Scaffold this motif. Structure first.
Motif, PDB file in Angstrom:
ATOM      1  N   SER A 229      42.494  51.213  56.300  1.00  0.00           N
ATOM      2  CA  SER A 229      43.063  51.383  57.675  1.00  0.00           C
ATOM      3  C   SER A 229      42.914  52.809  58.175  1.00  0.00           C
ATOM      4  CB  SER A 229      44.543  51.005  57.702  1.00  0.00           C
ATOM      5  OG  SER A 229      44.720  49.646  57.348  1.00  0.00           O
ATOM      6  N   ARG A 230      42.690  52.945  59.479  1.00  0.00           N
ATOM      7  CA  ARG A 230      42.717  54.239  60.149  1.00  0.00           C
ATOM      8  C   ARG A 230      43.521  54.147  61.444  1.00  0.00           C
ATOM      9  NH1 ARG A 230      38.083  51.894  62.312  1.00  0.00           N
ATOM     10  NH2 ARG A 230      37.443  52.812  64.319  1.00  0.00           N
ATOM     11  N   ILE A 231      43.891  55.303  61.976  1.00  0.00           N
ATOM     12  CA  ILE A 231      44.723  55.361  63.163  1.00  0.00           C
ATOM     13  C   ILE A 231      43.841  55.305  64.417  1.00  0.00           C
ATOM     14  CG2 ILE A 231      46.428  56.700  64.445  1.00  0.00           C
ATOM     15  CD1 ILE A 231      47.345  57.812  61.646  1.00  0.00           C
ATOM     16  N   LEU A 232      44.089  54.317  65.271  1.00  0.00           N
ATOM     17  CA  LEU A 232      43.418  54.224  66.573  1.00  0.00           C
ATOM     18  C   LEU A 232      44.338  54.835  67.622  1.00  0.00           C
ATOM     19  CD1 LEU A 232      42.122  50.550  66.328  1.00  0.00           C
ATOM     20  CD2 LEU A 232      40.881  52.628  65.688  1.00  0.00           C
ATOM     21  N   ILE A 233      43.901  55.940  68.219  1.00  0.00           N
ATOM     22  CA  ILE A 233      44.705  56.630  69.228  1.00  0.00           C
ATOM     23  C   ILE A 233      44.317  56.084  70.601  1.00  0.00           C
ATOM     24  CG2 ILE A 233      45.282  58.866  70.273  1.00  0.00           C
ATOM     25  CD1 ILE A 233      44.503  60.068  67.440  1.00  0.00           C
ATOM     26  N   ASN A 234      45.275  55.473  71.296  1.00  0.00           N
ATOM     27  CA  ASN A 234      45.042  54.855  72.611  1.00  0.00           C
ATOM     28  C   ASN A 234      43.767  53.995  72.683  1.00  0.00           C
ATOM     29  OD1 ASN A 234      45.605  54.311  75.398  1.00  0.00           O
ATOM     30  ND2 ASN A 234      44.147  55.921  75.981  1.00  0.00           N
ATOM     31  N   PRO A 235      43.689  52.954  71.837  1.00  0.00           N
ATOM     32  CA  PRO A 235      42.522  52.070  71.878  1.00  0.00           C
ATOM     33  C   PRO A 235      42.535  51.242  73.165  1.00  0.00           C
ATOM     34  CG  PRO A 235      44.193  51.137  70.455  1.00  0.00           C
ATOM     35  CD  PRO A 235      44.703  52.486  70.872  1.00  0.00           C
ATOM     36  N   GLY A 236      41.350  50.823  73.605  1.00  0.00           N
ATOM     37  CA  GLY A 236      41.172  50.162  74.893  1.00  0.00           C
ATOM     38  C   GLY A 236      41.475  48.674  74.899  1.00  0.00           C
ATOM     39  N   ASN A 237      41.136  48.038  76.027  1.00  0.00           N
ATOM     40  CA  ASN A 237      41.433  46.614  76.311  1.00  0.00           C
ATOM     41  C   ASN A 237      40.987  45.635  75.238  1.00  0.00           C
ATOM     42  OD1 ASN A 237      42.654  46.859  78.945  1.00  0.00           O
ATOM     43  ND2 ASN A 237      40.616  47.110  79.854  1.00  0.00           N
TER      44      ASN A 237
END
Ligand SMILES: [Ca+2]
Length: 594
Positions: A229-237
């Motif tokens: 797992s990794r951190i998605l910062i403000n991922p899109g639609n």
């Protein structure tokens, strides 16, 4: 339960640590803080601590002695925290001494959780060769060069970001003031902290933007990131919430955050590193990037970053790649990369060049930050940011900003509005950066005007990250991801960014959000800028652009010629905008931008 604290144990570091830790600890009644320190104890207020704090024990000894580890009971300790001597003249020696501490502690009891500071990124990498070092199980290294210069780097994209992030893990009591001053709104923003919490199963299948808007409007929670797992910062639609998704939130108290869980109803050329995460060029000899003052004066630069370095051939290395690398993240377009011009000692800067020589658009003017002629040559008045740093051996740094401010240019204009960020060693010296504010040595850094406006930074603000990481190490991972431009195995071995050819898979790594600042004078947000509310702006930005807003950078004097701005983190829906406001935001990568 108990923790052991070791390494750089002084009256300063003990008191500072207890202050952070005991502000954050919700079960302080049942937590014993055991300090192990090497030299004999002068009751360097050893006795007062024994009065003030009845759950604070001191032991004389070393973590290199197995008997001393038994005396403090490392085998049953919740964690061992290792404080570094941050101001050491020889950072490599300091890091090696702390790596040795980790080796000794882990030999005694392999499963002990260790949190350690590391001065330099390249030494942090050595911890991976310790078999029992397990970052997945909570072993954490807080790298001071990486984080401090990362905070500064992102502040070249949105001034004030260093202050905002610092204040998200500042462990202090909210302080109220009645009058409608700038301090009031700054201090409302300061009360925010970062939290993590699992998302309700009712959000599963919905997109991040949808869930983010629901959190904002219905729950009054600001969700900034997720991890499956990794951190998605403000991922899109296109990114949908799955079962057991962890959310990262900014809020005033932990109670509010619980609502999020319980919610119901080009092909032949190498242009990037092998991962595709950073822009990369073939190694240049330093002679190719050195400018004379005359040569620099011929090329007008604007929108650039001027980095003023105090230091000589004998100074300890800063690790300037920690500043440059985030400014070369692959989620920037080549054309929008900020030119970086170093001003300082060439014999110092020659020693940094080995780890900078693969970054494009880097120049060096041999000279000094105190020379007005050097500063004029590199167009100091047209830069997007002037960064002022000192290498390890404040008055030189402070003098440089005062000198820049008093310069005149071209109607003649002064340098008083030039964007500057100065790194300070001693918090107290923040008093000398601005001439229009209230000074007091007993007032903590975070309350001062230069800190509130993002024009000063000190590594001391990172001290509280030690306590923050102990209570929730996901916060460190988020902060590191945000400020470094994203991430390690290849760099741990080689200590260099290897170049690589672009593929579909490496090019897909470009598609991640960047820090930016939005203006409201014209364009689609100008109507809202004129007395509209923040919440309407937030929802519009998020829905239409998948742009996530997380605060305001507001003029202190919102008749005045002062263009100083202060940070307002996570303002409420109803917070009223003004046309001069700038908005802190995370913007999606746009592949077709031209
Ligand atoms: Ca002052």
């Amino acid at each position: 339960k108990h923790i052991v604290v070791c390494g750089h144990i002084t009256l300063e570091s003990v008191s500072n640590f207890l202050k952070d830790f005991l502000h954050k600890d919700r079960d302080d009644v049942n937590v014993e803080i055991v300090f192990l320190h090497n030299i004999s104890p002068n009751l360097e207020l050893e006795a007062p601590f024994k009065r003030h704090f009845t759950q604070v024990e001191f032991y004389q000894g070393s973590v290199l002695n197995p008997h001393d580890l038994a005396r403090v009971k490392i085998e049953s300790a919740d964690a061992c925290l290792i404080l570094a001597n941050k101001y050491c003249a020889d950072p490599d020696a300091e890091d090696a001494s702390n790596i040795m501490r980790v080796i000794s502690i882990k030999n005694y009891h392999p499963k002990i959780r260790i949190i350690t500071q590391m001065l330099q990124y390249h030494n942090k990498a050595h911890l991976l060769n310790i078999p029992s070092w397990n970052w997945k199980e909570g072993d954490d290294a807080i790298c001071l060069a990486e984080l401090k210069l990362g905070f500064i780097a992102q502040s070249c994209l949105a001034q004030g970001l260093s202050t905002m992030l610092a204040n998200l893990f500042s462990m202090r009591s909210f302080i109220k003031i009645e009058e409608d001053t700038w301090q009031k709104y700054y201090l409302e923003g300061v009360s925010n902290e970062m939290y993590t919490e699992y998302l309700s199963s009712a959000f599963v299948g919905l997109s991040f933007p949808t869930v983010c808007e629901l959190c904002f409007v219905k729950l009054k929670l600001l969700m900034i990131a997720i991890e499956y797992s990794r951190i998605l910062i403000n991922p899109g639609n296109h990114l949908k919430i799955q079962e057991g998704t962890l959310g990262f939130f900014i809020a005033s108290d932990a109670k509010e955050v619980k609502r999020a869980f319980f919610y119901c109803k080009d092909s032949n050329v190498k242009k990037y590193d092998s991962t595709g995460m950073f822009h990369w060029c073939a190694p240049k000899e330093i002679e190719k990037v050195i400018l004379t003052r005359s040569e620099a004066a011929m090329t007008v630069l604007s929108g650039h970053v001027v980095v003023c370095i105090f230091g000589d051939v004998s100074s300890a290395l800063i690790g300037l790649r920690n500043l440059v690398m985030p400014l070369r993240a692959s989620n920037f377009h080549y054309h929008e990369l900020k030119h970086i011009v170093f001003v300082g000692s060439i014999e110092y800067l020659k020693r940094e060049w080995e780890t900078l020589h693969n970054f494009p658009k880097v120049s060096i003017l041999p000279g000094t930050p105190l020379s007005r002629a050097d500063l004029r040559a590199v167009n100091i008045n047209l830069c997007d940011m002037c960064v002022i740093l000192s290498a390890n051996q404040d008055k030189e740094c402070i003098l440089a900003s005062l000198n820049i401010k008093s310069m005149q240019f071209d109607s003649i204009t002064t340098g008083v509005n030039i964007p500057i960020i100065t790194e300070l060693v001693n918090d107290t010296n923040v008093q000398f950066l601005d001439q229009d504010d209230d000074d007091d040595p007993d007032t903590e850094l975070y309350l001062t005007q230069p800190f509130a406006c993002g024009t000063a930074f000190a590594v001391s603000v990172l001290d509280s990250l030690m306590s923050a990481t102990y209570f929730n190490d996901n916060i460190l991972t988020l902060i590191r991801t945000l400020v470094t431009g994203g991430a390690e195995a290849l760099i741990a071995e080689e200590n260099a960014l290897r170049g690589g050819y672009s593929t579909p898979q490496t090019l897909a790594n470009r598609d991640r959000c960047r820090v930016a600042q939005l203006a409201l004078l014209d364009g689609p947000f100008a109507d809202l800028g004129d007395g509209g509310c923040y919440g309407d702006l937030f929802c519009k930005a998020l829905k239409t652009y998948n742009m996530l807003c997380f605060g305001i950078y507001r003029l202190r004097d919102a008749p005045s010629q002062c263009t100083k701005r202060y940070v307002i983190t996570n303002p409420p829906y109803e917070f009223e905008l003004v046309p001069t406001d700038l908005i802190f935001c995370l913007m999606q990568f746009d592949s077709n931008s031209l």
